[PDB]
Design an enzyme around this catalytic site. Structure first.
Site, PDB file in Angstrom:
ATOM      1  N   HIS A 286       0.818  -1.207   0.000  1.00 34.19           N
ATOM      2  CA  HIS A 286       0.000   0.000   0.000  1.00 34.19           C
ATOM      3  C   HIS A 286       0.855   1.261   0.000  1.00 34.19           C
ATOM      4  CE1 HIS A 286      -2.002   3.308   2.230  1.00 34.19           C
ATOM      5  NE2 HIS A 286      -3.029   3.001   1.457  1.00 34.19           N
TER       6      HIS A 286
ATOM      7  N   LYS B 169     -14.360  -1.768   3.095  1.00 34.29           N
ATOM      8  CA  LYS B 169     -13.976  -0.366   3.046  1.00 34.29           C
ATOM      9  C   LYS B 169     -15.144   0.564   2.760  1.00 34.29           C
ATOM     10  CE  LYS B 169      -9.463  -1.105   3.510  1.00 34.29           C
ATOM     11  NZ  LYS B 169      -8.576  -0.506   4.544  1.00 34.29           N
TER      12      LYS B 169
END
Length: 1974
Positions: A80, A145
RNA sequence: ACAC
RNA sequence: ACACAGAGACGCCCAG
RNA sequence: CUGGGCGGUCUUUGUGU
RNA sequence: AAA
């Protein structure tokens, strides 16, 4: 490539939009991968990125080649991190900033992107990535998410007026990019390629509370100490020995054989040293011991006389100040005399210059001789606009020579014959045969305690007027009697001498900084006395010289004795030769009067003499007081060693058979040069005490359970006294100043101590952790014994803790390290700048070494890009490893013990060492018998031990104790051993880093002081006697070879030892391992010993670092059993010193082994039940102040020092006298004897008594040190014009009075004191400005703090906020300002001449004086004319209710009418709790402000309660606004820093005082039986009476119907006010609700119960089963639910418990409207009811919101608790067993109690019983006059008890007396009453071949046999279980008990209580006494 | 304030 | 006079 | 061999509770 | 009546 382009690629529409997930796929034919390299070292992860391959789609544009660095901490998230290294924002923002605060608990969740779009809209983008090769993982990530943020954003957008909000989750992966935004396919492909590169990087490199765990785990997993480099760098640093010690077991044969050898060696030494076989008797053994002591003492005396200068008669005083007492007077300068200035010339050099000075002064100006009172009046009245008298005399050459002998101008006359003679003779040691009789005659006869007849004098009148002005609050005769006692102490001959000596020292301290020309002298006159001083000032570091001259017709009185040095006589005048003092010695001189007052008061209280009675002094008071006077004046470092060693010396007489007292051990430290007479006298007295205690042990006198020691005596004086007086006489030497300047001729002893063990280092490393050894020499040990000890401690910890203790320890240490910040380091501690540069002498001789603070290093680290602590460990490790050593500097702190050898530390070494320190601290906190990290265990091991032995062994058990120490605890602990034990007590991941860190300690280059090397190199000739000086000089000059030198370097190398302090927990863990192995070995030997009969015994071990105590108790059955068991336990305790060298311990010679009922663990001397802690040590430290910016903080520090004296065991009268002395000290440092204008300042203080303006608040005499400065401020505000001034100030704060510019005390300090007065200047800001401009901080920190007030309650987000907090901490009033300091008290007292009249006090721009500020307040406070309304007070003093409650108790006890009674033996440390946090506030101010401004869940109130508290806070301050920015503009402040300080400073604090006295409203007992030792003070509403009634109503012999009937009657008769709105478990609200249920003078009862509990109305519909833990405390395990109503809902919270944990479970609700308020209220309730949230609920089925960690879970993610949504006439009184439950009888099966009331033993008062007894014709208990004596505390005499006995008979019934209740009630009450005066007892294969000296019979001849002596156990636990009965403090039948005793003698029922027989027939005489029991 |  | 089983300080910088 | 002005002066306080 |  840019966030704004794709941000503007979206359309704006109303409401939140989640978009539509668009699936992506690669089509651009990615060619391959660039150049990728992995080079993971300790300093980071350097990844080399080459040029990307050329693609058909030309991707990889932003992957330009180069070097990228990744830290090891941020390696768990690297995919990420590198995937989105493009469009990610270069900032971080929280949701509370861009959105309004909703207090939902999810406003601190920062997302990845908060972009303020250019259309005035808000969008949020959250990155996500899944390592799955399909679309299901993409869908799962998208769902997670979107549920993480879909609801809270909706909550914040419902409030928001413009709903233009969009959510931007992207789910990137290897295969597709699941996104709800339209992404350019080139940009998406670029992001996918970056993720693929990051994934491959992770593969090639790997080979809120969870983020810290992940960070620390990733670092420790990826951290690689270069062990291959480490071995070649540091010696003995190979991992092979560590893994071998971890692998191989312990050879049991070696351990067995070594145990046998050590045990037989211990037996042989015990036999041959303690005078055993051939058989002798104790008398002749003691005679031989006395002869041996005589031999050793005479050998020491001969060895000291051989090195002396002979000279049996030598003249020099031991107190080098003249003995004269002059009569004070007004300030005047009289010069002319009868004979003129012509007879002074012909009297010597002193007379010459004393005539010259007077001739110059008389025929000249008197400016500078005294400070004029007019010249400073003009500068005090004015605004914005030291002058010593200087004269140069003739100075003939002979006079200059004589002055040069004594120090004055003594550097140029350095090579003169007389000066070289004196220099030769000044280095000559004296002799112990010095014939010192002057001191011995002085400490029997002296006039020090005689009154001086000086009651009315200027200093006495000023101090008395200030005392009366202080006493104005408390006008009681008690206060007047204590003040008259203080005045009588103040009028004594010695304090009137110390007043002018303190004035002289105060004048000298200011004169010290002044400098004079060659030949110049300064003449000064003391303020109140006709004493003239001639002063020669050298450099301030150097000594300052003074000569004193007096008229000699003014010497009214002289202190007697020859100790004072002789005085030259000039004829008319008396003069003294010049004497020298430096800065360090001055501290004792200024503080002498307070010291002497505290000493005379302390010893008078010690000798049973009360303050109010005035008597002729005894001999002992003169002895102690004169000794304190002498040792205080001389102030020499050798003198106080003797008394501190007499402590250890007189600790030997408590040693019992079979060992003899062997005090001669201490002679190895007494061999030291004696350079004065007082040292010789102390040596002689010490040796006489040594001989006396060697010839005879302290006799133990058993009694009726009580054990005492007799024969105790003062060490330095013959007189025999009580044990307490001896223990406190030991500490006398602590009066000498702890801090003294270290000269350059010193520090050679420090280097000698450091390198002493270095030479003895072994060369073969086979015994330093590799092999098993027997009898190692000085550094070696055996790994088998170490493994056995650590395995034993591991077993003990696993038994104490759970079986998963290692996993939780790993979680603990990872969470501790991960949460550490760089800012949490620094803290202004000195470091070392020693580096490779300094390592070459005469390169560095030109420059001067300076140690620097860690703050600058941390500033550089912050500017380096490092924020967490764990991010800088690799660079520091690399810097250390590239150096091959750790650099250490040196300083000599002086400690009241022997001496300290402080090793300063390099910043990098500190950074590396902090981690292993934390790692060891956690395992120490897991240990079950250590004290350093477990403060609880200190008072819960030596006090539980008596209780534990009572259970395990039985009543009448004999205890044996040991007190083990360590003499070489610093050097001797070879680092390998510590590393092995530590790594044994860790998981495998930590082991490498730990081993590397300890390997650093192998080589320790230490800097030698460069000034010392300047004179070491300049003299190549050694000379001298001590071989170490010659060794160092030769080693430096190179004509010798030692390991600890390298031919001309500035560093002394060192290979052995762990430097003192920097490892405080690893070696503590090692010592705990040793202690645990000793306990296991003792248990093993006790289970089989002495022919195999198991000696029943328990052993409990306690340890700190070097001081430890081993206690073994035993319970024998016969004389032979007792003696054999005691001998066996003595052998077990004696084997410790021999077993210890197997470890690196080396047992000290200061230890005390084999003591029966005595133990001294940490200077707390437990002499059986009597607990003795010295109070002289804290009485000596009463008046050591700290530098203060404000002026009330000085008084606050005085209060803290007084409170510490209270903890020490000082009586309240003594405490008040100490505070009276502190008043004098504060005024003297303020200027009471230096500044001429003090009188005007005194007059101004009289009119306006104000703290922080120099007025001293005096406490109540009865309660002196218990109450802090806050209580005194509150009382003065209630009863002085200080209330008027405070009201004015808080009107300025509220804003209803402008009062602009000057005034406006808008800043406050600690302890709830606010003032605009502060002396920031403090002798200028040179060092502060150097610290400020050295560091690169922004000097406009208040502007960024104003615009971003968020970082004052949050830990850390980004580097700018870290820099802002660093700038805040570098400008704090205390943290940075106070830390710089040397000798505080002289520096402060030197300001007494300009503080009163000069411009020093800033208005908190222009400066002013105390007088100027007082004159400005003289037209403000008087003009104000107001008062404090209750709201204003209850926010100036949140604890006001407790203050008035305590003041009511204090007001009751005033009268000085009382009886001296018998003292209490028991004496324990009770913890009386006072000033608890009030319940009617629901929160604190700062956390509420944080909740309103930023939504941080610090308070536990929710939106409704938050709004209500904000409403009343607005009522307090009308210009307080929700938005933080609007508050600064309106509110009277300057920045959020000032607002934060003001809010946090005035608050409620949980005060707690520990005490020392009888075991124990409870405040009144302490007020009465603690005022004076052996003296009760004998002092002569509505709810108190109700409590007193209801206690015996619920706990009594009554019947249930009668119980509830008189409950109703008592509730109806009394008047109870309406309840309040409390937040926690209170009893007053329950009493009020109980009253209102029956009176029914309100609404519905359920509504009132619901609102009284802040909206909570419920109870345990299904309770849980109760189990009794060891001590009572019925705990709740099993299955149960809790049903009630929270915030207009319906709740069914389920509770489940199995052990000591009560984790919550499924939270059943009824609606989703107000979950947050329900959560907050339920958290509050679970906190009060003891319900934590650690175990996740077993339920995993259908749920919506989980609950873990008492925090809101946005998703089912991290599975927690399934929060599921889905008659005011039946109430009554249960009264069913002393609990007044009410219940609701809810739907069938459940009763649902709602309120409870448990009557405790405290709610009893004297007045209530008498008032009820008089009003007997008012209630329903007036009838049955045998009763109401159970309700009212009466004393049933013979007739009333006969009435009760006739009523009882066999079985008779009355209206409500019940049956079988009178039996147990009388049993408990009267068994406790009989226990008061006694009667009923309380709570009733290394074998020695059976050889025997005389079958262990003649060894113990003439001994106090103890197994039949009915001896009681000792420990505060055993005095609490005896008082655990609910009926102890009752006097029902006590006269009946004493008449029973008078009838049956002292014996009587001693038989029947033990074995049933008195005479087998008594019958009618005492029949009811037997009917009571059986 | 205590202990290294 | 301080410190010391003789290390030091007993004033420092500059100008003539 | 005499004068002058400077100067929390200089660091002098580590590790934990 | 749970510290």
């Amino acid at each position: 490539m840019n966030l704004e382009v794709l941000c503007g690629r979206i359309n704006v529409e109303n409401g939140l939009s989640l978009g539509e997930p668009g699936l992506y796929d690669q089509i651009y034919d990615r060619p391959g991968l660039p150049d990728l390299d992995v080079t993971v070292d300790a300093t980071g992860v350097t990844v080399d990125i080459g040029a990307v391959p050329d693609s058909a789609s030309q991707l990889g544009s932003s992957i330009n080649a180069g070097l990228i660095t990744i830290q090891l901490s941020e390696a768990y998230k690297i995919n990420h991190d590198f995937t989105f290294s493009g469009l990610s924002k270069t900032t971080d923002r929280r949701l509370s900033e861009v959105f309004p605060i909703t207090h939902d608990g999810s406003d601190g969740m920062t997302p990845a992107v908060i972009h303020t779009r250019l259309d005035g809209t808000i969008v949020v983008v959250e990155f996500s990535t899944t390592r799955s090769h399909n679309i299901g993982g993409l869908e799962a990530a998208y769902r997670t998410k979107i549920e993480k943020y879909r609801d809270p954003i909706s909550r914040r957008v419902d409030i928001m007026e413009n709903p233009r909000v969009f959510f931007g989750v992207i789910v990137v992966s290897s295969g597709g990019v699941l996104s709800n935004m339209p992404l350019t396919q080139d940009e998406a492909e670029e992001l996918m390629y970056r993720f693929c590169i990051a994934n491959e990087i992770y593969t090639k490199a790997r080979s809120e509370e969870l983020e810290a765990i992940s960070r620390a785990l990733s670092f420790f997993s990826l951290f690689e100490p270069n062990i291959e480099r480490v071995e070649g760098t540091f010696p003995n640093s190979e991992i092979k020995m560590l893994e071998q010690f971890l692998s191989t077991p312990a050879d049991v044969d070696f351990i067995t054989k070594t145990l046998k050898a050590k045990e037989v060696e211990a037996y042989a030494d015990l036999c041959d040293s303690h005078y055993l076989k051939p058989e002798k008797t104790i008398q002749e053994r003691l005679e031989i011991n006395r002869c041996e002591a005589i031999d050793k003492t005479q050998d020491l005396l001969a060895g000291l006389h051989a090195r002396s200068n002979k000279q049996t008669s030598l003249n020099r005083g031991t107190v080098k100040l003249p003995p004269w007492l002059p009569k004070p007077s007004s300030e005047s300068i009289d010069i002319k005399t009868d004979s003129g200035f012509g007879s002074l010339m012909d009297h010597g050099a002193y007379g010459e210059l004393w005539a010259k000075c007077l001739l110059d002064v008389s025929l000249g100006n008197v400016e500078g001789v005294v400070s004029d009172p007019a010249k400073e009046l003009d500068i005090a009245i004015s605004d914005d606009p030291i002058t010593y008298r200087r004269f140069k005399p003739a100075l003939s050459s002979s006079a200059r020579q004589e002055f040069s002998l004594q120090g004055v101008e003594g550097k140029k006359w350095k090579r003169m014959a007389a000066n070289q003679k004196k220099e030769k003779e000044s280095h000559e040691t004296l002799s112990p045969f010095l014939d010192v009789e002057d001191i011995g005659d002085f400490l029997t006869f002296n006039n020090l305690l005689t009154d001086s007849r000086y009651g009315d004098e200027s200093i006495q009148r000023a101090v008395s007027i200030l005392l009366e002005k202080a006493s104005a609050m408390q006008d009681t005769e008690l206060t007047h009697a204590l003040n008259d006692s203080f005045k009588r102490n103040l009028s004594s001959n010695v304090v009137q001498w110390s007043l002018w000596v303190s004035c002289l020292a105060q004048e000298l301290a200011s004169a010290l900084k002044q400098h004079c020309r060659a030949g110049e002298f300064i003449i000064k006159k003391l303020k109140f006395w006709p004493i003239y001083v001639i002063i020669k000032p050298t450099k301030s570091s150097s000594h300052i010289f003074y000569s004193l001259g007096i008229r000699k017709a003014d010497v009214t009185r002289r202190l007697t004795g020859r100790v004072f040095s002789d005085t030259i006589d000039a004829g008319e005048w008396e003069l003294t030769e010049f004497k020298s003092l430096k800065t360090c010695k001055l501290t004792n001189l200024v503080n002498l009067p307070c010291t002497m007052l505290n000493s005379i008061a302390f010893w008078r209280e010690k000798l049973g003499v009360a303050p109010w009675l005035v008597r002729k002094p005894c001999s002992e008071l003169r002895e102690q007081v004169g000794l304190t006077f002498l040792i205080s004046l001389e102030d020499k470092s050798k003198t106080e060693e003797i008394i501190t060693l007499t402590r250890y010396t007189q600790m030997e007489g408590f040693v019992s058979p079979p060992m003899l007292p062997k005090p001669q051990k201490m002679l190895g430290k007494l061999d030291g040069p004696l350079r004065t007479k007082l040292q010789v006298y102390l040596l002689r007295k010490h040796l006489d005490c040594m001989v006396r205690i060697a010839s005879q042990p302290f006799s133990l006198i058993p009694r009726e359970g009580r054990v005492e020691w007799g024969g105790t005596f003062h060490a330095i004086s013959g007189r025999s006294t009580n044990l307490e007086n001896m223990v406190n006489s030991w500490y006398i030497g602590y009066y000498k100043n702890k801090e003294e300047s270290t000269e350059l001729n010193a520090l050679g002893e420090m280097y000698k101590k450091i390198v002493e063990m270095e030479e003895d280092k072994p060369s073969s490393p086979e015994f330093l952790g590799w092999g098993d050894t027997d009898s190692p020499k000085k550094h070696e040990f055996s790994r088998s014994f170490l493994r056995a000890a650590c395995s034993s401690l591991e077993r003990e910890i696993a038994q104490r803790h759970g079986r998963q203790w290692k996993q939780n320890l790993e979680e603990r240490v990872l969470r501790e390290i991960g949460t550490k910040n760089i800012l949490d380091l620094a803290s202004m501690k000195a470091t070392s700048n020693f580096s490779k540069d300094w390592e070459l002498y005469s390169e560095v001789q030109t420059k001067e070494y300076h140690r620097s603070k860690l703050l600058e290093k941390m500033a550089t680290l912050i500017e380096k890009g490092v924020m967490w602590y764990i991010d800088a460990v690799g660079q520091a490790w690399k810097a250390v490893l590239d150096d091959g050593c750790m650099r250490i500097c040196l300083f000599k702190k002086n400690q009241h013990g022997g001496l300290r050898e402080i090793y300063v530390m390099d910043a990098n070494a500190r950074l590396v060492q902090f981690g292993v320190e934390t790692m060891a601290r956690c395992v120490c906190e897991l240990s079950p018998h250590e004290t350093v990290a477990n403060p609880r265990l200190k008072n819960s091991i030596i006090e539980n031990h008596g209780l534990k032995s009572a259970r395990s062994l039985g009543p009448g058990s004999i205890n044996i104790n040991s007190s083990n120490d360590a003499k070489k605890w610093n050097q001797g602990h070879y680092t390998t051993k510590l590393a092995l034990v530590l790594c044994w007590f860790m998981p495998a991941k930590f082991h490498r880093f730990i081993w590397a860190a300890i390997s650093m300690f192998r080589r320790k280059k230490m800097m030698v002081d460069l000034r010392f090397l300047a004179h070491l190199s300049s003299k190549s000739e050694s000379r001298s006697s001590d071989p170490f000086r010659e060794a160092m000089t030769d080693a430096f000059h190179g004509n010798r070879d030692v390991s600890w030198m390298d031919k001309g370097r500035t560093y002394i190398k060192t290979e052995t030892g762990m430097m003192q302090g920097i490892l405080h927990f690893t070696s503590s863990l090692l010592h705990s391992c040793v202690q645990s192995f000793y306990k296991s070995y003792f248990v093993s030997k006790l289970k089989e010993g002495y022919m195999g009969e198991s000696i029943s015994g328990v052993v409990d071990v306690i340890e700190g670092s070097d001081d430890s105590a081993i206690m073994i108790s035993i319970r024998p059955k016969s004389d032979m059993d007792e003696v054999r068991s005691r001998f066996f336990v003595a052998n077990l305790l004696h084997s410790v010193k021999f077993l210890n060298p197997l470890f690196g311990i080396y047992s000290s010679e200061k230890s005390t082994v084999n003591t029966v009922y005595c133990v001294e663990y940490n200077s707390e001397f437990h002499f059986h039940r009597h607990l003795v802690r010295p109070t002289l040590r804290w009485i000596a430290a009463s008046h050591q102040i700290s530098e203060t910016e404000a002026l009330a903080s000085r008084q606050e520090d005085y209060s803290n020092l007084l409170t510490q004296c209270l903890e020490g065991g000082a009586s309240f009268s003594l405490t008040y006298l100490i505070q009276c002395a502190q008043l004098l000290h504060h005024y003297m440092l303020l200027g009471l004897c230096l500044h001429p204008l003090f009188g005007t300042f005194m007059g101004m203080l009289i009119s306006d008594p104000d703290p922080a303006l120099g007025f001293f608040l005096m406490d109540n005499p009865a309660f002196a040190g218990g109450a802090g400065f806050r209580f005194n401020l509150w009382r003065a505000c209630k009863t002085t014009d200080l209330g008027r001034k405070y009201a004015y100030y808080f009107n300025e704060i509220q804003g209803k009075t402008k009062g602009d510019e000057d005034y406006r005390a808008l800043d406050a300090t600690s302890g709830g004191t606010l003032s605009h007065s502060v002396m920031v200047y403090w002798g200028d800001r040179k060092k502060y400005q150097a610290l400020l401009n050295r560091m690169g901080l922004p000097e406009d920190w208040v502007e960024q703090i104003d615009e971003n007030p968020g970082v004052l309650y949050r830990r850390a987000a980004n580097k700018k906020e870290l820099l802002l907090k660093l700038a805040e901490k570098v400008h704090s009033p205390g943290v940075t300002s106070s830390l710089s300091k040397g000798h505080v008290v002289p520096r402060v007292v030197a300001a007494g001449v300009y503080l009163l009249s000069r411009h020093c006090f800033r208005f908190s721009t222009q400066k002013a004086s105390l007088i100027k500020l007082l004159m400005m307040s003289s037209i403000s406070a008087m003009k104000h004319g107001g008062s404090l309304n209750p709201n204003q007070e209850r926010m100036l003093f949140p604890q006001a209710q407790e203050y008035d409650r305590v003041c009511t108790l204090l007001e009751e006890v005033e009268h000085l009418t009382g009886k001296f009674v018998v003292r209490e033996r028991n004496i324990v440390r009770s913890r009386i709790d006072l000033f608890q946090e009030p319940v009617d506030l629901r929160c604190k101010a700062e956390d509420l402000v944080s909740e309103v401004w930023f939504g941080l869940k610090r308070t536990k109130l929710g939106p409704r309660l938050l709004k209500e508290e904000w409403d009343k806070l607005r009522a307090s301050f009308a210009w307080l606004s929700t938005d933080p920015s609007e508050t600064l503009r309106d509110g009277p402040f300057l920045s959020h820093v000032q607002f934060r300080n003001f809010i946090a400073h005035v608050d409620a604090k949980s005060r707690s005082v520990r005490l020392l006295g009888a075991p124990v409203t409870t405040i009144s007992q302490v007020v009465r039986m603690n005022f004076f030792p052996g003296f009760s003070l004998e002092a002569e509403e509505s709810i108190s009476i109700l409590k007193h009634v209801l206690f015996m109503v619920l706990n009594g012999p009554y019947t249930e119907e009668y119980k509830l009937e008189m409950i109703i009657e008592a509730f109806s008769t009394l008047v109870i006010p309406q309840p309040s709105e409390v937040i926690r478990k209170s009893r007053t609200m329950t009493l009020c609700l109980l009253s209102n249920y029956l009176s029914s003078r309100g609404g519905s009862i359920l509504d009132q119960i619901e609102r009284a509990q802040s909206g909570t109305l419920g109870g345990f519909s299904k309770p849980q089963k109760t189990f009794v833990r060891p001590g009572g405390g019925v705990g709740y395990k099993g299955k149960g639910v809790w049903t009630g109503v929270m915030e207009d809902t319906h709740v069914q919270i389920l509770i489940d418990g199995d052990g000591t944990s009560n984790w919550l479970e499924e939270i059943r609700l009824s609606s989703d409207a107000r979950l947050y308020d329900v959560i907050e209220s339920i958290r509050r309730l679970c906190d009060d009811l003891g319900i934590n949230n650690r175990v996740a609920s077993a339920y995993r089925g259908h749920c919506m919101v989980r609950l873990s960690g008492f925090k809101i879970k946005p998703a089912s993610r991290t599975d927690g608790c399934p929060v599921r949504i889905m008659n005011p006439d039946e109430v009554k009184m249960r009264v069913r067993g002393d609990i007044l439950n009410l219940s609701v009888t809810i739907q069938e099966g459940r009763v649902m109690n709602i309120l409870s009331y448990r009557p405790r033993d405290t709610d009893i008062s004297e007045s209530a019983a008498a008032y009820l007894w008089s009003n007997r014709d008012l209630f329903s208990f007036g009838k049955k006059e045998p009763s109401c004596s159970w309700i009212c505390l009466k004393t049933l005499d013979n007739w009333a008890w006969s009435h009760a006995s006739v009523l009882l008979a066999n079985d008779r019934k009355t209206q409500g007396i019940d049956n079988r209740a009178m039996g147990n009630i009388f049993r408990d009450c009267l068994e406790g009453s009989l226990r008061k005066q006694g009667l009923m007892r309380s709570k009733l294969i290394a074998v020695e071949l059976s050889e025997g000296s005389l079958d262990i019979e003649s060894i113990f001849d003439g001994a106090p046999i103890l197994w039949s002596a009915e001896v009681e156990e000792f420990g505060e636990g055993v005095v609490a279980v005896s008082y655990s009965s609910k009926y102890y403090h009752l006097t029902l039948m006590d006269q009946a008990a004493i008449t029973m005793c008078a009838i049956m003698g002292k014996e009587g029922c001693r038989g029947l209580l033990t074995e049933k027989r008195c005479m087998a027939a008594i019958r009618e005489q005492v029949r009811p006494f037997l009917i009571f029991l059986q």
